[PDB]
């Protein structure tokens, strides 16, 4: 069911924060553990601020904190070109339950279209289920990212789900879950943007985990 997939997502969601060495932590969004020490996380969380690799990355797992130099995480793209969401290996994180088999297969994408879905996410660790209207797939989606200084940049990815719904800051990194029980309520991808009552999630397929 949607609710049981949601529980599996919920257990693998951690809070992702960034800070300077010896500095305060800025808690930014969610990251989703997928298997072993690998997580999915929107790279817009860190990649557009100055000297990211000298920052410390922080992972909050139910009030137990793990930190690591940004230079010591291994970042792996999901596909060719910019897709925002990346895979990130964090050697210091406890092993996650493998949920990769709960992600949609590329060939089953048509089965999630025109049906409801649920965004399973948090705002700074408080779990929320957000209803999304019948899904569409945008071959190219564009959204505006506001950096820490206040200035904004425009970002564009391949293959993003679009659904009617109400999002809040900090919900990025949560998982979109199909209402379609005939594909076992597959995880469709990762929430990256919201606004004007529309929610956008990058498609993440099972096949993408073949990139380790």
């Amino acid at each position: 069911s949607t609710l049981e997939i949601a529980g599996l997502v919920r257990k693998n969601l951690v809070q992702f924060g960034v800070g300077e060495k010896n500095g305060s932590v800025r808690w930014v969004m969610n990251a989703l553990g997928v298997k072993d020490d690998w997580l999915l996380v929107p790279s817009h969380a860190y990649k557009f601020e100055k000297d990211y690799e000298m920052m410390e990355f922080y992972f909050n797992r139910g009030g137990t904190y793990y930190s690591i130099s940004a230079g010591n995480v291994v970042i792996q793209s999901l596909d060719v070109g910019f897709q925002d969401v990346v895979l990130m290996k964090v050697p210091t994180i406890p092993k996650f339950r493998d949920i990769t088999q709960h992600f949609i297969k590329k060939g089953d994408v048509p089965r999630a279209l025109n049906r409801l879905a649920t965004l399973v996410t948090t705002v700074n660790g408080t779990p929320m289920l957000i209803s999304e209207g019948p899904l569409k797939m945008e071959e190219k989606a564009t959204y505006v990212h506001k950096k820490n200084d206040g200035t904004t940049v425009d970002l564009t990815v391949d293959q993003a789900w679009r659904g009617k719904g109400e999002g809040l800051p900090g919900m990025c990194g949560g998982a979109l879950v199909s209402s379609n029980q005939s594909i076992q309520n597959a995880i469709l991808g990762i929430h990256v943007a919201g606004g004007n009552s529309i929610l956008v999630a990058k498609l993440v397929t099972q096949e993408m985990f073949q990139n380790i």
């Binding site: 929107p42 817009h44 989606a141 564009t142 959204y143 505006v144 990212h145 506001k146 970002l155 999002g167 809040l168 800051p169 900090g170 919900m171 990025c172 929430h191 990256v192 943007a193 919201g194 606004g195 004007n196 529309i198 956008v200």
Partner: peptide, 4 residues
Amino acid sequence: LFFE
């Protein structure tokens, strides 16, 4: 649409 905004980063959220």
